[PDB]
Amino acid sequence: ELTLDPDTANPRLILSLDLKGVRLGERAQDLPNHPCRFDTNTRVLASCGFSSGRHHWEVEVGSKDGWAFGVARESVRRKGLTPFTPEEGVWALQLNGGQYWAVTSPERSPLSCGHLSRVRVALDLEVGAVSFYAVEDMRHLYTFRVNFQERVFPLFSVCSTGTYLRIWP
Amino acid sequence: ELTLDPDTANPRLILSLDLKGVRLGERAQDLPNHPCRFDTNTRVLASCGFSSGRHHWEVEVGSKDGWAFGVARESVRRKGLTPFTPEEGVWALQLNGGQYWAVTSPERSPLSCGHLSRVRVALDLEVGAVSFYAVEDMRHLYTFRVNFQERVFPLFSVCSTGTYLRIWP
Ligand SMILES: NC(=O)CC[C@H](NC(=O)c1cccc(Oc2ccccc2)c1)C(=O)O
Ligand SMILES: NC(=O)CC[C@H](NC(=O)c1cccc(Oc2ccccc2)c1)C(=O)O
């Protein structure tokens, strides 16, 4: 079962008591400056990452703008504002402008998928893929094909108040 | 009376003979590595920038994704991949995903303006604003309000083949 890693979380994020949920707050928490902590970008990783095999989880997503989630390679940079892009080691979907995106670069890719409530993330480290599905009807949203070469962690980001992400059984 | 400054242009850009038009090509031109040149982001400035008063120009825009334009402060960073954001000195509209945006951060602002062919940029360095209008019917698209404190240059960016920007009388 995944849980969010509080040592990675940007200090403006609020992690739920059960460490499954994240939203953005107004307060910058006073937290230890661990190297694994995202000090500027509004990100948090799960506590455990994967090096091989197939793994899946589900993310409950808010209806309002401001979230992005998927996976990141461990070496994703933690300090400073870093780009949210595949080149920088993040493979994610995002909600911005009432629209859903795969965060490709330099052009984001529109999904045109309609409203999402819960998304299944399927990480395949044998093939080198990460895929996203809408849980309601399992329609395929997006797949990134990647030559993963290190440990890969579930990634969550919430850069606006009023939305959330939550890991769901 | 604006022209694009070839010394600023990313080497993958193609500037028109009259230095009014820009598109992205496949070839990295062999150009001098002037400090003013954008070496990675797909940007070019006009040759002249403004420190006071009101100035306007028009930009013909392609229908396909990949452009952004507006204004940039002179101090906009030219080297490396740098964020395309107000905090980094760029105030711009963008076409990305069949969607028009004002490039706010951390969330882009959708314009929901319908198809654009030509856009008037009105830079007001007395008030501290840059505004964008659709030329068809002069409807107001967006205004950034900024405490400008240095010379501000017209900015153009084309990060995908198949689209263009052109300065229009
Ligand atoms: N959630 C998403 O859609 C992914 C984008 C996300 N953006 C940022 O983190 C970002 C980008 C620019 C400024 C910025 O600064 C702030 C810091 C504290 C609170 C609010 C904004 C934060 C990320 O890269 O993970
Ligand atoms: N026009 C726009 O919508 C503005 C965004 C624009 N993006 C980039 O420049 C960018 C962003 C990431 C990678 C990248 O690399 C490339 C280099 C050569 C050709 C293609 C892409 C370029 C910018 O910041 O001006």
From Swiss-Prot, chains A, B:
Protein name from the UniProt record: E3 ubiquitin-protein ligase TRIM7
Subunit-level organization: Forms homodimers. Interacts with GNIP2. Interacts with GYG1. Interacts with RNF187 (via C-terminus).
Tissue: Skeletal muscle and placenta, at lower levels in heart, brain and pancreas. Isoform 1 is widely expressed with high level in testis, kidney and heart.
Free-text domain note: The B30.2 domain mediates interaction with GYG1.
Native source species: Homo sapiens
Role, per record: E3 ubiquitin-protein ligase that have both tumor-promoting and tumor-suppressing activities and functions in several biological processes including innate immunity, regulation of ferroptosis as well as cell proliferation and migration. Acts as an antiviral effector against multiple viruses by targeting specific viral proteins for ubiquitination and degradation including norovirus NTPase protein or SARS-CoV-2 NSP5 and NSP8 proteins.
The family this protein is said to belong to: Belongs to the TRIM/RBCC family.
Gene assigned in the entry: TRIM7
Result, substituting F84A: Complete loss of substrate binding
B30.2/SPRY domain mapped to chain residues: 1-169
Intracellular or extracellular location(s): Nucleus; Cytoplasm; Golgi apparatus
Superkingdom per UniProt: Eukaryota
Residues of the full protein shown: 343 to 511 of 511
PTM: Auto-ubiquitinates via 'Lys-63'-linked polyubiquitination.
